[PDB]
């Protein structure tokens, strides 16, 4: 009970500081952020 | 009101609303992120 209760609090201190552990979910958003900004920039192209 | 536009030869369809920003006095029109006209100066009197 000393080892387990300190181990959950190291997860809470890591996620409050380091933001790159959740960055696999941030690559879900940023691939969709380039995909919705793809079709906006194609409207300014003259296409010949 | 949604109406048809002819503004100095340039055509479109939209709703005319009042601009709150600071614009150039020599500006005929201006473009959005998709390079279409979202704002245009009135020809007879000075209003955008």
* Residues with Cβ within 8 Å of residue A15, at least 6 apart in sequence: A21, A22
The token duo for A25 is: 């979910």
Residue of B nearest to A42 (CA): B34
Strands (E), chain B: 3-7, 10-14, 29-31, 37-40
CB pairs under 8 A, 24+ apart, for A33-42? A40/B33, A40/B34, A41/B34
Q: How far apart are the C-alpha atoms of B27 and B19, rounded to whole Å?
A: 14
**A window 1-40, beta carbon within 8 A of B:** 40
Method: cryo-EM
Measure A26 CA to nearest chain B CA, in Å. 24
* Residues with Cβ within 8 Å of residue B47, at least 6 apart in sequence: B41
Resolution of the coordinates in A? 3.4
Cβ-Cβ contacts under 8 Å between A and B: the total is 8
Q: Cα A43 to chain center, whole Å? A: 28
Is there a contact between B7 and B40 (Cβ–Cβ < 8 Å)?
A: yes
Residue of B16, B32, B14 lying closest to A43 (CA atoms)? B32
């Amino acid at each position: 009970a000393n080892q387990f209760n300190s181990a959950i609090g190291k997860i809470q201190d890591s996620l409050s500081s380091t933001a790159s552990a959740l960055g696999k979910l941030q690559d879900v958003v940023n691939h969709n952020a380039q995909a919705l900004n793809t079709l906006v920039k194609q409207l300014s192209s003259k296409f010949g | 009101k949604c109406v048809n536009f002819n503004f100095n030869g340039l055509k479109g369809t939209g709703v005319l609303t009042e601009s709150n920003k600071k614009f150039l006095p020599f500006q005929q029109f201006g473009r959005d992120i998709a390079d279409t006209t979202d704002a245009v100066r009135d020809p007879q009197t000075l209003e955008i």
